[PDB]
Ligand binder design. Structure first.
Ligand SMILES: Cc1cnc(Nc2ccc(C(=O)NC3CCNCC3)c(F)c2)nc1Nc1cc(NS(=O)(=O)C(C)(C)C)cc(C(=O)N[C@@H](CCC(=O)O)C(=O)O)c1
Length: 126
């Protein structure tokens, strides 16, 4: 089947606030993962058509990627920091659902998740 449209990243009707937690999520957490050797397979939605991935968007009905997260942070899409943390965790979980344990993409996701947890350990208080 065709790829779905990407997740929404901006909504002018959503209320906007800046918090220490959201700032840290963009400037520390996202930034660190984005520059990692293994960021690139996660920097945009999975193009399952081009990659010929069987049934990808039947298996993965809550897709998420770091390009979407980055835009959401930049557009003040998130009100609560937990919304952003949940999006990262959805991305990791989705990788572990679709792909065999120990395969290359899974090892890349695990390396990014380890870094994510290191940085989240120092998230500012609410
Ligand atoms: C986030 C994510 C999750 N799950 C997957 N599952 C995949 C993906 C690919 C394959 C694959 O190619 N299997 C071969 C053919 C069938 N038999 C076995 C060998 C696979 F089996 C599973 N992939 C995700 N992300 C992702 C992965 C990859 N490649 S990869 O092999 O996993 C690796 C080199 C190890 C990272 C590429 C991109 C990507 O975005 N590439 C281009 C645009 C697309 C294009 O040009 O075709 C870009 O960078 O823009 C993204």
């Amino acid at each position: 089947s065709m790829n779905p449209p990407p997740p929404e990243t901006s909504n002018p009707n959503k209320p906007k606030r800046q918090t220490n937690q959201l700032q840290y999520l963009l400037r520390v957490v996202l930034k660190t993962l984005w520059k990692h050797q293994f960021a690139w397979p996660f920097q945009q939605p999975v193009d399952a058509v081009k990659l010929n991935l069987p049934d990808y968007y039947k298996i993965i009905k809550t897709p998420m990627d770091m390009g979407t997260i980055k835009k959401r942070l930049e557009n003040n899409y998130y009100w609560n920091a937990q919304e952003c943390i949940q999006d990262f965790n959805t991305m990791f979980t989705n990788c572990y659902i679709y792909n065999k344990p120990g395969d290359d993409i899974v090892l890349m996701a695990e390396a990014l998740e380890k870094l994510f947890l290191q940085k989240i350990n120092e998230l500012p208080t609410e």
